Design a protein around this motif. Structure first.
Motif, PDB file in Angstrom:
ATOM      1  N   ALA A  45       0.816  -1.208   0.000  1.00  0.00           N
ATOM      2  CA  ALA A  45       0.000   0.000   0.000  1.00  0.00           C
ATOM      3  C   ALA A  45       0.852   1.262   0.000  1.00  0.00           C
ATOM      4  N   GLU A  46       2.070   1.189   0.541  1.00  0.00           N
ATOM      5  CA  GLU A  46       2.939   2.362   0.554  1.00  0.00           C
ATOM      6  C   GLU A  46       3.301   2.806  -0.859  1.00  0.00           C
ATOM      7  N   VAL A  47       3.576   1.855  -1.751  1.00  0.00           N
ATOM      8  CA  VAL A  47       4.024   2.169  -3.103  1.00  0.00           C
ATOM      9  C   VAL A  47       2.995   1.592  -4.078  1.00  0.00           C
ATOM     10  N   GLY A  48       1.729   1.572  -3.658  1.00  0.00           N
ATOM     11  CA  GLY A  48       0.683   1.043  -4.522  1.00  0.00           C
ATOM     12  C   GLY A  48       0.586   1.777  -5.845  1.00  0.00           C
ATOM     13  N   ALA A  49       0.627   3.102  -5.799  1.00  0.00           N
ATOM     14  CA  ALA A  49       0.660   3.922  -6.998  1.00  0.00           C
ATOM     15  C   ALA A  49       2.102   4.250  -7.364  1.00  0.00           C
ATOM     16  N   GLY A  50       2.291   4.682  -8.607  1.00  0.00           N
ATOM     17  CA  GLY A  50       3.634   4.989  -9.069  1.00  0.00           C
ATOM     18  C   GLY A  50       4.242   6.140  -8.286  1.00  0.00           C
ATOM     19  N   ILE A  51       5.552   6.060  -8.075  1.00  0.00           N
ATOM     20  CA  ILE A  51       6.274   7.106  -7.359  1.00  0.00           C
ATOM     21  C   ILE A  51       6.540   8.261  -8.313  1.00  0.00           C
ATOM     22  N   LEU A  52       6.186   9.475  -7.886  1.00  0.00           N
ATOM     23  CA  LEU A  52       6.351  10.642  -8.748  1.00  0.00           C
ATOM     24  C   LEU A  52       7.819  10.912  -9.052  1.00  0.00           C
ATOM     25  N   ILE A  53       8.688  10.789  -8.051  1.00  0.00           N
ATOM     26  CA  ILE A  53      10.102  11.109  -8.189  1.00  0.00           C
ATOM     27  C   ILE A  53      10.923   9.915  -7.727  1.00  0.00           C
ATOM     28  N   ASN A  54      11.955   9.578  -8.494  1.00  0.00           N
ATOM     29  CA  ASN A  54      12.845   8.476  -8.163  1.00  0.00           C
ATOM     30  C   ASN A  54      14.025   8.985  -7.349  1.00  0.00           C
ATOM     31  N   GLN A  55      14.420   8.205  -6.347  1.00  0.00           N
ATOM     32  CA  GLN A  55      15.587   8.503  -5.534  1.00  0.00           C
ATOM     33  C   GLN A  55      16.457   7.259  -5.439  1.00  0.00           C
ATOM     34  N   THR A  56      17.762   7.478  -5.315  1.00  0.00           N
ATOM     35  CA  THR A  56      18.706   6.369  -5.270  1.00  0.00           C
ATOM     36  C   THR A  56      18.499   5.553  -4.000  1.00  0.00           C
ATOM     37  N   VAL A  57      18.382   4.238  -4.161  1.00  0.00           N
ATOM     38  CA  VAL A  57      18.143   3.317  -3.058  1.00  0.00           C
ATOM     39  C   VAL A  57      19.302   2.333  -2.998  1.00  0.00           C
ATOM     40  N   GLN A  58      19.941   2.246  -1.834  1.00  0.00           N
ATOM     41  CA  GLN A  58      21.052   1.327  -1.654  1.00  0.00           C
ATOM     42  C   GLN A  58      20.553  -0.111  -1.568  1.00  0.00           C
ATOM     43  N   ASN A  59      21.429  -1.046  -1.924  1.00  0.00           N
ATOM     44  CA  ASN A  59      21.094  -2.460  -1.829  1.00  0.00           C
ATOM     45  C   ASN A  59      20.978  -2.878  -0.369  1.00  0.00           C
ATOM     46  N   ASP A  60      20.044  -3.791  -0.094  1.00  0.00           N
ATOM     47  CA  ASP A  60      19.801  -4.206   1.283  1.00  0.00           C
ATOM     48  C   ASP A  60      20.902  -5.120   1.810  1.00  0.00           C
ATOM     49  N   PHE A  61      21.438  -6.002   0.965  1.00  0.00           N
ATOM     50  CA  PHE A  61      22.484  -6.915   1.417  1.00  0.00           C
ATOM     51  C   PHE A  61      23.806  -6.179   1.603  1.00  0.00           C
ATOM     52  N   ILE A  62      24.337  -5.608   0.527  1.00  0.00           N
ATOM     53  CA  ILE A  62      25.569  -4.830   0.566  1.00  0.00           C
ATOM     54  C   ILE A  62      25.188  -3.372   0.347  1.00  0.00           C
ATOM     55  N   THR A  63      25.311  -2.557   1.394  1.00  0.00           N
ATOM     56  CA  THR A  63      24.879  -1.168   1.310  1.00  0.00           C
ATOM     57  C   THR A  63      25.943  -0.286   0.665  1.00  0.00           C
ATOM     58  N   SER A  64      26.462  -0.724  -0.466  1.00  0.00           N
ATOM     59  CA  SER A  64      27.369   0.057  -1.298  1.00  0.00           C
ATOM     60  C   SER A  64      26.923   0.102  -2.748  1.00  0.00           C
ATOM     61  N   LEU A  65      26.361  -0.987  -3.263  1.00  0.00           N
ATOM     62  CA  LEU A  65      25.822  -1.007  -4.612  1.00  0.00           C
ATOM     63  C   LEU A  65      24.477  -0.293  -4.652  1.00  0.00           C
ATOM     64  N   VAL A  66      24.150   0.252  -5.819  1.00  0.00           N
ATOM     65  CA  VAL A  66      22.916   1.000  -6.028  1.00  0.00           C
ATOM     66  C   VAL A  66      21.982   0.158  -6.885  1.00  0.00           C
ATOM     67  N   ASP A  67      20.720   0.075  -6.474  1.00  0.00           N
ATOM     68  CA  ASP A  67      19.729  -0.653  -7.253  1.00  0.00           C
ATOM     69  C   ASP A  67      19.485   0.053  -8.581  1.00  0.00           C
ATOM     70  N   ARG A  68      19.395  -0.731  -9.649  1.00  0.00           N
ATOM     71  CA  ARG A  68      19.331  -0.204 -11.002  1.00  0.00           C
ATOM     72  C   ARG A  68      17.891  -0.192 -11.510  1.00  0.00           C
ATOM     73  N   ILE A  69      17.723   0.312 -12.730  1.00  0.00           N
ATOM     74  CA  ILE A  69      16.432   0.352 -13.406  1.00  0.00           C
ATOM     75  C   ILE A  69      16.395  -0.778 -14.424  1.00  0.00           C
ATOM     76  N   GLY A  70      15.371  -1.623 -14.333  1.00  0.00           N
ATOM     77  CA  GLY A  70      15.299  -2.805 -15.168  1.00  0.00           C
ATOM     78  C   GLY A  70      14.557  -2.617 -16.473  1.00  0.00           C
ATOM     79  N   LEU A  71      13.419  -1.928 -16.432  1.00  0.00           N
ATOM     80  CA  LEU A  71      12.565  -1.772 -17.599  1.00  0.00           C
ATOM     81  C   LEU A  71      12.218  -0.306 -17.807  1.00  0.00           C
TER      82      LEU A  71
END
Lengths: 439, 49, 50, 50
Positions: A45-71
């Motif tokens: 429900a928090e992200v049920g609708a599309g997010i208006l603005i994208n922000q960089t999110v760190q990886n949960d396992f290794i908090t150094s890599l940045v999650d990428r855009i897939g599609l």
């Protein structure tokens, strides 16, 4: 440039009716009990609708890599107006269009003793003209900066698709604006009482009201095409005749649904209960009471004068500018039959038409004026004649006979007024004509 | 009002649905049927109820 | 998504000085993340079930 | 979720695996170098003054 955004909440412009998470949480269970077993309901429900603005999110396992855009998906649409069938040809040269019409005369009783002294008299024919001008001149301006846009894409297909989407939009804008202007034509025509209003309400049956609107529309279409003609369906009050193959009808989506559901479904052999003229459907009319408009083919007077596109390039800024210029003339003829079906409250008198709108008389001459009152109800109203010439000796008879004083030089205005408002708050419907003085 | 209160209510619900479906798929499009006000159009084979 | 544009009135006097003016297109973007991440757990005691 | 192509993913996994062997080699070198210092500190190591 390095544009960044800091501390933007995930629900920017959302005004929720109720808190879904709280409603699910504090529910003993009557309708939300199905979502109680769900584990990640709050996160969904928090992200049920599309997010208006994208922000960089760190990886949960290794908090150094940045999650990428897939599609990445590109959305493209094509739009056009369905009223292009009402457009006439092109006018390359000239600005003004002149339309001329001639009415009928009146019969005179055969008298031989009275015909001695007026063999050579004059009976001026009833003619009237109107003019249409060029009134639309616009352009659409769009810039493309490919070098700066290259950094926002990774593949070579998305970039081309985005450029093509911009090029498609620069045309879709004009396509929708033409439809908006054509609809504004009808709205403006109705906004000044130039339509002949027919009320849909008041069935006066008490047993059936589903077929009342279709019955009234069929009757109006049938009486528009009578061979003898009528003066009751145009703003010029001229005896005119229409043909069923030239009658068009713009209807609302609600009206189309009502016709399809209430009468067509329950009616056998619906060929005798459907509509008569050609039928087109739009999203609706901006006017309060407008439901349908029945017009003639020659009602529209829309022409195109210019349609072109020109491009320029800025090499210092490394971009392209596109200008799409469109010039058009939009008008509607008053000599064609045009009625509007309304389903609300309308004034008792719509308009007053004086037959000679423009006249020229001598200093000692006289003129005759005839007034037609477009009344929605069945009862009649009386007109009052007045003149605002401002010179003594000029008066108008109560029947509509204007006499000019022999010593004056002014532009005469002759007004016919109908009072429809209640006492202490008079409402006036006024139709006036202009007279010139020949010395 | 209610799709089950009466047959008249059911018929007017059907009329409203048909009107909305027809005006969703008009060629000129509209921007009064989505969260973000953009001119877009749908198709009958793509609409789902 | 790209959402059309707005028309402007023709004016040669302003076009005399606004030839190279820029007009940004109307583009709207949105982003969707992954939000459902769960598992179903079941234990089976075959020896006790025998 | 941190990679787009597979080859980068296998390369990262291989680097993670090889880090263990690199650490083992470094620690082995340090351990074997410790022997000279220990033997010299215990005094059982012949010395020449320079």
């Amino acid at each position: 440039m390095r544009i960044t955004f800091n501390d933007v909440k995930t629900s920017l412009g959302i005004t929720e009716s109720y808190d879904i998470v709280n409603a699910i949480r504090n529910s003993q269970g009557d309708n939300f009990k199905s979502y109680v077993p769900l584990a990640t309901a709050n996160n969904v429900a928090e992200v049920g609708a599309g997010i208006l603005i994208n922000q960089t999110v760190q990886n949960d396992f290794i908090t150094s890599l940045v999650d990428r855009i897939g599609l990445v998906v590109i959305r493209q649409v094509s739009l056009n107006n369905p009223l292009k069938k009402f457009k006439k040809g092109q006018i390359p040269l000239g600005r003004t269009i002149e339309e001329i019409y001639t009415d009928i005369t009146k019969e005179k009783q055969y008298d031989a003793e009275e015909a001695e002294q007026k063999v050579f008299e004059r009976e001026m024919p009833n003619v009237k003209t109107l003019f249409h001008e060029r009134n639309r001149q616009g352009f659409y301006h769009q810039t493309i900066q490919d070098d700066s846009l290259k950094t926002a894409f990774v593949s070579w297909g998305n970039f081309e698709s985005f450029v093509s989407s911009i090029i498609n939009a620069i045309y879709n804008s004009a396509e929708v604006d033409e439809y908006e202007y054509m609809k504004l034509l009808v709205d403006n025509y109705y906004s000044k009482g130039l339509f002949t209003t027919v009320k849909i309400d008041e069935p006066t049956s008490s047993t059936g009201a589903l077929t009342e609107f279709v019955k009234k529309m069929r009757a109006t279409a049938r009486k528009l095409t009578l061979p003898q003609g009528s003066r009751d369906w145009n703003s010029m009050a001229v005896r005119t005749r229409s043909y069923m193959e030239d009658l068009h009808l713009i209807i609302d989506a609600d009206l189309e649904a009502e016709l399809d559901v209430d009468v067509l479904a329950k009616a056998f052999n619906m060929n005798r209960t459907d509509f008569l003229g050609n039928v087109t459907v739009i999203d609706g009319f901006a006017s309060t009471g407008l439901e349908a408009v029945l017009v003639d083919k020659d009602w529209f007077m829309v022409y195109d004068n210019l349609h072109k596109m020109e491009t320029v390039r800025n090499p210092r800024g490394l971009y392209w500018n596109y200008y799409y210029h469109v010039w058009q003339t939009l008008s509607v003829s008053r000599f064609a039959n045009a009625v509007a079906f309304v389903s609300g409250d309308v004034p008792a008198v719509t308009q007053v038409i004086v037959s000679p709108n423009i006249a020229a008389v001598k200093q000692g001459g006289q003129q005759q004026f005839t007034a037609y009152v477009r009344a929605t109800n069945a009862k009649d109203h009386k007109v009052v004649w007045s003149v605002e010439g401002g010179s003594t000796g000029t008066a108008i008879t109560g029947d509509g006979l204007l006499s000019v004083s022999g010593n004056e030089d002014n532009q005469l205005t002759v007004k016919a007024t109908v009072d429809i408002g209640t006492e202490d708050k008079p409402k006036l419907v006024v139709g006036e004509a202009v007279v010139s003085i020949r010395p």
